[PDB]
Structure formats: structure tokens, C-alpha cells
Design a protein around this nucleic acid. Sequence first.
DNA 1: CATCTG
DNA 2: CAGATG
Length: 327
Amino acid sequence: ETLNGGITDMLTELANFEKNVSQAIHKYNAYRKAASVIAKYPHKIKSGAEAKKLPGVGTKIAEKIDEFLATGKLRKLEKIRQDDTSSSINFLTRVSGIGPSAARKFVDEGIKTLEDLRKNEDKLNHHQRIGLKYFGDFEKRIPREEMLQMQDIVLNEVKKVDSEYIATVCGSFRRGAESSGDMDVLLTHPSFTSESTKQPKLLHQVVEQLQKVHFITDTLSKGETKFMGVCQLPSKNDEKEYPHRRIDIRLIPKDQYYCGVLYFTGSDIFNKNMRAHALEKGFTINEYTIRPLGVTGVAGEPLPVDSEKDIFDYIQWKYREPKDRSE
DNA sequence: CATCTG
DNA sequence: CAGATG
Ligand code: NA
Ligand code: NA
């Protein structure tokens, strides 16, 4: 956690690069189990050889570890942090809509900057465009004080469209968090479930209302169950307009809301322990359901859940306020 | 995993 | 349809 930190960090720089710049998914994955294990390792790694002793740790990595321990640096790491091509890819990738793949294409075409991008707006797709247009707003965190106003609007409009909708704002926002990166709404309706064959309108109507009143400004991607967009809190009395914020809305069959809701609220850590505990308690849990574990190895059958309560209950646990869902 | 692009 | 992005 701090004993093999530099090592784990270097390995991470390395892994990322294989994957983003080179195409090296193997190598890339290589660096990763490595950091994973050295990370778990209980002592202070004093040499390559020592590491090498670990699984995932081979000779090449061992080698690297040596030089890093030998000197506060690594040449290769040093070489890469300079390299403009590598840098460009890390940068372009920052735009919503640009993954490594595209980052490579553009670079090879000479687009390496924001400006490059603007000049070449023709080569970018809709998502990518939006991403470019709101590069700044997109990188800005979302303070809870805004978050509450957003939630305030969303929930109100949903209610108006149908009294039966149930919306929830998951994420860190839900666990306390002073700021967040984006708005995540989980949505369901009684008239939508596991069996029930579809109901796209269910999601389209809300999206539409949100646009009606102007809260939603652009569409990144709109499916029949998942909407990805951009929204904005109406600028008050002109002098201070708000940043453009990322937002997602997803329809869920009512028969698996809370597991979803549970799940999305996190944290990853909370999940895990919760998950692991479930298991002890003779249970299974994933994003959509909780199932009674048979003994034959495994088994299933969705347990019936009416709230996040039913869940804990199941695994016989202490109902946790979202704030304390931390770890 | 769901959506988009080409 | 494969392949990309989130
Ligand atoms: Na990106
Ligand atoms: Na292939």
C-alpha cells in the first residue's frame, strides 16, 4: 500500500502505455497482474530477483524493477514521458468520444491538439464533437450544491410525466460525496419488468420532458434503455451560466431496481464485501439480483426485493445508510 | 453491456 | 457485421 508503491506505479505507467500507444494488450495485461501481485505482497521488495519470485513476475519486469530500485528512475519510462506521439495520444483520449484507437488515427494524421481538432471538426463524429465542444465543462467536477439542484429538476419532471416512475440518483452523490463527475439516474416503472416485453416510450418520454424544459442540451447516445447526454442548470439571472454536465439515464425493469440501485451506489469496496458476505450467508449477488446458493456447487432463482432493505435482510446484515456504504 | 459508426 | 467508446 506504500511499501511497493513506486514499483506498482511504474508498472502501471508501463501497462497503460502498452495498451494506449502500442497495441500491446498482452504486455499491457502483463504489467497489470504484476502490479496487482506486488501490490498484495507483504514485504519491501529489495531487488528484482526477489520480485521475480512472484507469479506474473518474469525476467523483463524483474529487470525493470532492478533499474528502478538501482536509480530513482527508469529510462524507458523516461523516454515515453517525452515522446510527443505518446503524449498526444494521452491527450486526445481526454476528449469524450476519443478512445485510443481514434487517438492513434488522428495522430497519424497530424491532429495532436485541440486546435487540430477544431480545424478538423469534419473528421469527428457527433459524440466526439460534443466532447470537443465541452472539453472544459467535461473536466470540471460537479459540486453537490449543483447536484441537488439537478436532482431537484429531474425528479420533478419525471413525476410530472408519470406518477409511477421511480428515479434515483446513484453514484457517490448518493453515498455523501461533496462533488461528482457526472449525474447517474436509475429509472424504473411498475409497468416494466423482467418478462414484460419492452416499453421504450418508458425512457423516451422522460428524456423528452427533460429537453422540453431545456435541462438536457445534447444527445450523446439514445437507446431504448440507456440514454447518454449533456444537461445544464439554467443560468439564473445572466452573469453566471453553468457548465455543461454529463448525464445518463437508464431504464430498469422494476423487478431488479434495488439490486441495480444498490450496486450503482457503491463503493466498489462496499460491494465486494457485501458480495462476499452474501456468499457466506448462502447467497448470490450481481447488478440485477440476489440468489439463494444451492450446494451442488451453485444454483439460482431470483429472490424477491422491494427495497435495498430486502437485500441486506437476505444476507442478514445491518442496513447501511448510503453515507456509510463507504467500505 | 448498450449504442454508434461505417 | 466487427470494432469502438463510455
Ligand atoms: Na476520450
Ligand atoms: Na478478430
